[PDB]
Amino acid sequence: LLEINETLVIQQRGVRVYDGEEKFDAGTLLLSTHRLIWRDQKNNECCMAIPLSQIVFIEEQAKIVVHLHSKNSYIRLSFKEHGQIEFYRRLSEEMTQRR
């Protein structure tokens, strides 16, 4: 599900999406030149989130955190299936020139 002038960067699986700290959602996070695509494990409502222009700042916690915008400021991504820091690199590089 990509727009014109928008291209793929990397697809990595085994991702989880936590709000603040949580006792998540499994599936595959897909980054792109313009959006932070997220296709879920349960196809029925597959393919949701797509910020990337709003994500203010990203960092590492211990997993990669994303401050997308009483309520939580961010969501965090866990990389169970190895694919971390190849993603952190490509998420920072692409997100910063998206102003």
Binding site: V56, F57, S73
Partner: protein
Amino acid sequence: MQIFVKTLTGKTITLEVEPSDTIENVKAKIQDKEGIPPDQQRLIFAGKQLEDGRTLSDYNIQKESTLHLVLRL
């Protein structure tokens, strides 16, 4: 000039500053009107994080720009 540092609440702090101003100095202003200790502040600018011993000038920040505030986890 005066810059604005938006918080993740959508709050905007209107700060009056100069290019010769340093980042920690800027965090001082922040705290003199928002409570936030400079220890927890992280002034962001287009993804790039702004380090303390560097003047706004070094980041080529202009009048009425917009920086963001993100509390350390």
